């Protein structure tokens, strides 16, 4: 399993709230990057139902 991605819009805006349980997996050590990774993880897990059964939708996670 892999995630092929490309940035459609890249910015230097760092205004991102902090979070609880910032990820420390995959070489990450928490922090805002960890907040983003934990956010993506939740969204990907949420979407498993949609590749299993079809359908789309908008999923969100605090970051």
């Amino acid at each position: 399993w892999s995630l092929r991605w490309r940035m459609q819009k890249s910015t230097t805006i760092a205004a991102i709230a902090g979070c609880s349980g910032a990820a420390t997996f995959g070489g990450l050590a928490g922090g805002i990057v960890g907040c983003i990774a934990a956010g993506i993880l939740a969204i990907l897990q949420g979407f498993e139902v949609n590749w299993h059964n079809g359908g789309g939708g908008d999923r969100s996670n605090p970051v």
Partner: protein, 77 residues
């Protein structure tokens, strides 16, 4: 901070009854966050793949708007 939520706008390409292990999901998420967003706001276009199979398309949006960005999914097949 301004951005408080990350959104994923998705659609299915193919049905796949398989499920990636946590190890795979962790690697996928870490890669995008670290190398794609790099701790900044932005928009990513992605495809979840199961080997060579294109399974799911997701537009990931991290912006100042906590509101659902709507729009269409985008991909990187």
């Amino acid at each position: 901070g301004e951005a408080t939520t990350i959104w994923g706008v998705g659609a299915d390409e193919a049905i796949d009854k398989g499920t990636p292990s946590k190890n795979d999901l962790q690697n996928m998420s870490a890669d995008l966050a670290k190398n794609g967003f790099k701790g900044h706001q932005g928009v990513a276009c992605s495809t979840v793949k199961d080997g060579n199979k294109d399974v799911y398309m997701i537009k990931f949006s991290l912006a100042g708007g906590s509101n659902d960005p709507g729009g269409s999914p985008c991909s990187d097949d």
